[PDB]
Design a protein around this ligand. Structure first.
Ligand SMILES: CCCCCCCCCCCCC/C=C\[C@H](O)[C@H](N)CO
Ligand SMILES: CCCCCCCCCCCCC/C=C\[C@H](O)[C@H](N)CO
Ligand SMILES: [Cl-]
Ligand SMILES: [Cl-]
Ligand SMILES: [K+]
Ligand SMILES: [K+]
Ligand SMILES: [K+]
Ligand SMILES: [K+]
Ligand SMILES: [K+]
Ligand code: NA
Lengths: 58, 242, 297, 245, 49, 242, 49, 99, 58, 48
């Protein structure tokens, strides 16, 4: 379509498939989000990574 | 006009309906989004982060609440003594309510996947010991002794330079998903039990404390997913919030 | 130009956020691979060092003998929009005939969604949130009856004149957006953009909005974030004469196009006041249930 | 090789022979603000070595009965060194931090501290105990300066949230039988590109004993906890006269 | 005006017309008038089996 | 008919809704549009035009209102004297309300950009002088002396053949946009202060007036934009307009 | 808005009408279907037994 | 005195950094500013009264009777536009009756 | 479409993207305007332009 | 707290028994003459 880029997610590393009937994109449906995850950001934010087989503190 | 005909559902307001609504501010543009560290994309990212499991969920007086975060071990005078026990059900009242996993679990009716509990020993460097941590799948009653606990899934933990050990509670279920287990017919969905025994003994030399504590950290494995979004059992307000 | 070596080999000004981790697609739960017995020295997946700050990296396959399981379980329902794009009550406005509160056919509600616990606890799982929203307005009498009454809803951004009567000149609404709807019509519903001067709304602001001495008299401003203050929602019965009916307006919000940053521990004590984390010191409760001993269920 | 470490920044070097790796908060290193995220137009000043260096600010004594403490950033440093001066003379500020918490005992002592960084750490009050009074925390409690402040109710972190879940934040543990320090690198966290170092604390540092300190009578009973920290990639803008509040 | 709410197992069941549970922040609810046509929705296959 | 189903929002009249409405006069054609000078396309075009800033917003009696448009300078007997001060906040009550920028600002909730104030000296050709005009960013209190004012952004102005000087108030904010600042928590959005000092002195020879006036003209720079259209704080009518 | 005109049948609830209704649980995914013996596809299969 | 506005910019008065400005200018177009419906007329049809008491009223079209709208349009001398008119009717209490 | 050129903006140096369901174009939505600006018309209408670096009155 | 503002090393006792403190050449002149009380204190290196 030919609307404005009003949505709160314009420039998000994940892309959506939404529906809209208005010139402003924030009026659009929530749609579908891509299913990417990065748990290491929270669960394993160590500088020097350690493998599963080794002893963590060597 | 173009011929149309209204169907049931007309005028209803379904709170989960994903529709389109008239925008109040035409041509409005939001403040750009700068880079902010720590963006989360899926709740499952948080379920994999270990938080403290309150195995010792017994003291309730406000001045002793911190004691819930750790449980003890000490020199036993003998053999195969029981140290602690708890249900492995993540969305059931009890120890898991202290974990973020437990809490996020509250917003979903069903779950599936393996769990893991990592136990960190915090005694002195001079203290040694071996513990047997067992997971008893559904149907097995609370083990009366170490000899019956040892028949289920288990890890024998040796204290040492690596302070911690992980007990994986593998997904062993009859159904693909479990709903939250509770007393009654929904006990059909129970995960089972975890029990900790002394494999040998907590041993220490002259000069080191006779009692030490273990801190448990729990989370889900990568095969863990949840479904059927629902409201949590708790509503944290009494009257109106002012 | 820069001639001294230290200026040339300087990293001052590097604006690239160097990230140690990256997102991978993950539409289903992870599968399980076949594993067998391992009786080996040196290799030890069960042993960890929680002090490091990371979660355990031990998997089912390395702790017990596993079969192969092909896992098709979807991860779609735990995306932020799945979790948050569900409308919940965030406001309630009373327009009674006789009364102490809003007795004159109009009311001004400062937009704040922290007055209701279900919604508040969910959003506070994160520190920063950016999203668009759909607002639905359900109006009726206090018994839930539908009466033939015309209402006007007006959004009053900060600095726009707030009405002070059912006949305020401000209701001319020449620039502010207004919705005229009958109680007999379906609930009014509109889309709202992300409006903060900041890149995100923040449920927690550890600071003060202004400079100066922070004397006890003005401590009610600790944690006050003007960037979350979007204005006033004003409602009135459309007339110069008083309405024949007592009314109630319930406000529902549904977030969409959601982004969130910095997860935090979830609320474990009852909420007492709006936008402030005070809890009752005499009634600090354990997060969950208790039992009599650590050795019995 | 995971246990030994040396941190050198500015004219300062820290060593440790009993480390447990390094945590890089949210898996992201600190960086300067880009030309697209920035909004303020004056050319910033980036003092470098004179402000990005380690400052040892305080020592607490760990006692068998200790509750835990917190410090607020950048509050702890606004009155120290060249960093403090810049934070005072400029309206805008931004930086990351390398935090190094120190605590050594002996192979016969025991205990475990949780060292965590919680962004936007808003303090709450007990609401007059009954919960009927909307009281607010005073300035000395929200921004304690270099002295830090002691937690009154560690279980709910003086803010109605469970310390049991604090590990969802960048953290390390100082478990005496294992290590004697915690090192956390924190990038600048805010919803704005720059902000006031005085009016806003971006995050709080929490040092809380979870497994209490213990030892037999006769072993050194004074076990200090020292806090050393270094700003990283500091930038300042909006220059005028010096202001402390 | 009526409110219909689906309460999955484990979600709090309302115990009064004023229960806090009616905030319905996650459960699906339908608000409809008796004067409107019959409310109607689609439901997926929900068993753990 | 084709099956449809009505959704919430049905029948509402949203005043900012950009829809299609039935035309009342079919096949009607408007009078053609001839060329007219001065067409404006964007309000931002008007924000860049300088209008008179009432720095001297003190006299209120109808016969002295014109005095608000200019402020004075005169021979001082000494050093570093304060001449005038005002807040730089364009959408705040005060001096800026006299400017078109200030007024247009009233129709928008947020703004962003640099501002500029041009000061024109209107004394005799024989009068000389140097003034220090300073802009103090947020957090700095009103400078007590020229020595503290001089530490902020400033211009030292020399009277001469070029009658005027421009003080740019650069965009120095923590947020990408500012809402209108006012006493209270919204002072969070204040732009700061402008103060004018005597750098040397107003000097004149025998025969020229000892007092002269300065006229200030203010406007926005090209990086200035506004967002979130709203109604202005004033409504210029008391009762009904007849 | 786009010009439409309502026809008879409007608002009726015909129990055999095969229409589309708003889904109550967005992005919900059912438990997969494993193989189960004895699936029937048509009642006529039973009439022959 | 020339009659022009100052041409001095931030860059020439202080030392500036580079700022890439993505802030939109779309909301200050004339349609953004004016294409918002405001009250321009009010007609009373009372039962008993001095004004329009006989079930009908004639209103000469003039939008200058209400200040919010009038002040905005008077920012310009000449204006050319199309318009959408909406008519909201009810009793003086805001009640809806079958009329 | 195939309507009449009834709009008040037919022949405007700026083009719009509107929606309409009627034969008269003035019935159309407001749409989007192009974002061109000419501030010099008001802020700098001098016959002989002067640069930023020079002294205005030479 | 004031010592910590200069050049420093935080030393941790452990398996490596020793630590080195480098006193970097930080002088105004290219060379220093021997420092002593009086005007030649101009050449002092500083304190540890
Ligand atoms: C014509 C009706 C329009 C109604 C307009 C509603 C606008 C609502 C904007 C969403 C704001 C999100 C909530 C923001 C902040 C929080 O409520 C608190 N201030 C946090 O302290
Ligand atoms: C069936 C209902 C049709 C209603 C027709 C409304 C036509 C209105 C035309 C717009 C006129 C714009 C206002 C023009 C002039 C000003 O009001 C004053 N005369 C200025 O002195
Ligand atoms: Cl469960
Ligand atoms: Cl302002
Ligand atoms: K027809
Ligand atoms: K899979
Ligand atoms: K229409
Ligand atoms: K039909
Ligand atoms: K640009
Ligand atoms: Na391992």
């Amino acid at each position: 379509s030919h609307e404005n880029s009003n949505s709160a997610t314009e420039g998000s590393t994940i892309n959506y498939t939404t529906i809209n009937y208005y010139k402003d994109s924030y009026a659009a449906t929530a749609g579908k989000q891509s299913l990417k995850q990065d748990p290491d950001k929270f669960a394993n934010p160590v500088k020097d990574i350690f493998t599963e087989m080794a002893a963590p503190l060597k | 006009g173009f011929p149309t005909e209204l169907k049931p559902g007309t005028n209803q307001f379904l709170t989960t309906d994903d529709g389109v609504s008239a925008p109040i501010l035409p041509n409005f543009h939001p403040t750009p989004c700068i880079h902010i560290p720590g963006e989360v994309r899926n709740l499952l990212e948080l379920c994999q982060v270990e938080t403290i499991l309150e195995v010792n969920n017994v003291p309730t007086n406000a001045t002793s609440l911190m004691e819930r975060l750790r449980f003890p071990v000490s020199a036993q005078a003998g053999k195969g003594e029981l140290c602690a026990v708890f249900r492995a059900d993540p969305g059931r009242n009890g120890p898991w309510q202290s974990t973020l996993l437990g809490q996020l679990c509250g917003y979903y009716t069903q779950w599936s996947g393996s769990l893991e509990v990592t136990f960190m020993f915090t005694g002195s460097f001079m203290a040694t010991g071996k513990m047997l941590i067992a997971y008893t799948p559904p149907g097995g009653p609370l083990p009366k002794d170490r000899a019956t606990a040892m028949l289920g899934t288990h890890v024998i933990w040796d204290f040492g330079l690596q302070s911690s050990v992980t007990l994986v509670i593998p997904w062993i279920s009859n159904t693909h998903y479990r709903a939250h287990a509770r007393d009654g017919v929904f006990d059909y969905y129970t995960t089972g039990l975890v029990s900790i025994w002394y494999q040998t003994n907590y041993v220490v030399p002259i000069g080191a404390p006779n009692t030490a504590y273990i801190i448990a950290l729990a989370a889900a494995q990568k095969n863990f997913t949840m479904k059927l979004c629902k409201d949590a059992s708790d509503i944290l307000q009494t009257g109106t919030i002012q | 130009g820069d001639r001294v070596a230290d200026v040339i080999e300087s990293s001052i000004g590097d604006s690239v956020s160097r990230a140690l981790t990256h997102a991978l697609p993950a539409p289903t739960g992870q599968n399980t691979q076949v594993s067998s017995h391992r009786l080996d020295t040196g290799k030890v997946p069960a042993l960890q060092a929680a002090e490091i700050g990371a979660s355990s990296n031990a998997s089912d396959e390395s702790m017990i003998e596993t079969r192969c399981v092909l896992n098709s379980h979807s991860t779609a329902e735990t995306t932020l929009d799945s979790f948050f794009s569900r409308a919940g009550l965030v406001g309630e406005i009373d327009l009674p005939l006789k009364g102490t509160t809003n007795p004159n056919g109009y009311a001004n509600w400062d937009i704040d969604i922290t007055g209701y616990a279900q919604m508040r606890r969910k959003v506070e799982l994160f520190t920063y949130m950016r999203f668009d929203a759909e607002f639905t307005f359900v109006a009726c009498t206090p018994t839930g009856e539908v009466v033939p009454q015309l209402l006007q809803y007006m959004f009053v951004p900060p600095g726009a004149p707030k009405p002070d009567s059912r006949e305020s000149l401000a209701w001319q609404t020449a620039t502010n957006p207004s919705v005229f709807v009958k109680l007999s019509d379906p609930p009014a519903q509109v889309s709202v953009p992300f409006m903060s001067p900041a890149s995100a709304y923040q449920w927690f602001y550890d600071g003060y909005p202004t400079f100066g001495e922070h004397k006890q008299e003005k401590d009610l401003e600790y944690g006050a974030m003007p960037n979350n203050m979007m204005g006033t929602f004003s409602v009135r019965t459309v007339g110069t004469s008083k309405s024949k009916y007592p009314l109630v307006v319930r406000i529902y919000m549904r977030m969409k196009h959601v982004r969130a940053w910095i997860p935090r521990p979830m609320r474990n004590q009852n909420y007492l006041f709006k936008a402030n984390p005070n809890y009752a010191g005499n009634s600090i409760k354990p997060t969950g249930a208790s039992r009599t001993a650590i050795t019995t269920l | 090789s995971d246990r030994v470490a040396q941190l050198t920044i500015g004219n300062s070097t820290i060593t440790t022979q009993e480390a447990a790796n390094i945590i890089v908060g949210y898996g992201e290193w600190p960086s300067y603000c880009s030309d697209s995220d920035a909004t303020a137009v004056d050319k910033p000043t980036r003092p470098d070595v004179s402000v990005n260096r380690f400052y040892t600010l305080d020592t607490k004594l760990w006692e068998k009965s200790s509750k835990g403490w917190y410090w607020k950033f950048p509050d702890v440093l606004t009155e120290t060194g060249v960093f403090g001066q810049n934070a005072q003379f400029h309206y805008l500020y931004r930086s990351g931090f390398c935090i190094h918490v120190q605590c050594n005992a002996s192979k016969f002592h025991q205990g475990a501290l949780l060292v965590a960084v919680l962004p936007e750490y808003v303090i709450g009050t007990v609401a007059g105990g009954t919960g009927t009074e909307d009281t607010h925390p005073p300035y000395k409690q929200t921004q304690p300066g270099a002295d830090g402040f002691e937690l009154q109710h560690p279980y709910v972190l003086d803010a109605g949230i469970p310390i049991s879940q604090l590990t969802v934040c960048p953290h390390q543990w100082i478990n005496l039988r294992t290590n004697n320090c915690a090192t956390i690198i924190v990038p600048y966290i805010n919803a704005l590109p720059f902000d006031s170092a005085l009016n806003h604390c971006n995050f709080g540092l929490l040092v809380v004993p979870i497994s209490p300190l213990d030892y037999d009578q006769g072993a050194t009973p004074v076990i200090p906890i020292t806090i050393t920290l270094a700003p990283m990639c500091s930038e300042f803008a909006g220059l005028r006269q010096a202001v402390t509040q």
